[PDB]
Structure 1
Amino acid sequence: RQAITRAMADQARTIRIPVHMVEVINKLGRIQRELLQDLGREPTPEELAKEMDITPEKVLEIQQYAREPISLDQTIGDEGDSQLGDFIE
């Protein structure tokens, strides 16, 4: 399990993140899902921050680090003839 989780930390994002940031982000994810089931709504930034003993400033930074790149080859129009790359100034 330790090898497989190490691998899932290293080789699973297009922009690699070190392991410890992956651990903090997964803690954030667990706390968000469980606090969703409990609060009934998705909790707030300050709420999760107070919950993980970190700053509500830092929580947004972690959330920004945890955004995966959207592909540049998903045909944007329903009539599929324009890659998404054809619309970035």
Structure 2
Amino acid sequence: EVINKLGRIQRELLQDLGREPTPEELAKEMDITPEKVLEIQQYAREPISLDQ
């Protein structure tokens, strides 16, 4: 849930300034601190395949 919230906010807020939001901008609107945001971004990671 919170991962989707972060994704939607990151996608949407770009039009306000023309940049991909960084932890400062994301935290300014997610009501959470940057370190938790970094932890969420790490948690949203997905494994690659060895067979490539």
TM-score w.r.t. the length of structure 2 is 0.90
Deviations 1:55-85 (A, max 9, x none): 11100000000011011111xxxxxxxxxxx
Ranked by relative contact order (alpha carbons within 8 Å, sequence separation 6 or more), the top structure is: 2
Is residue 50 from structure 1 mapped to residue 28 from structure 2 by the alignment? Answer: yes
Cα distance, 1:36 vs. partner?
1.7
CA distance in 2 between counterparts of 1:34 and 1:52 reads 12
Cα distance, 1:47 vs. partner?
1.1
Is residue 39 from structure 1 mapped to residue 13 from structure 2 by the alignment? Answer: no
Structural RMSD (CA): 0.9
Greater Rg over alpha carbons, structure: 1
Q: Which runs of 5+ in 2 are unaligned?
A: none
Give the percent of matched residue pairs that are identical in Structure 1 and Structure 2: 100
Tell me the secondary structure at the aligned position of residue 47 of structure 2: coil
Higher helix share: 2
The runs of at least 4 consecutive aligned structure 1 residues that moved more than 6 Å come to: none
**In the comparison of the two structures, how many residue pairs are matched?**
52
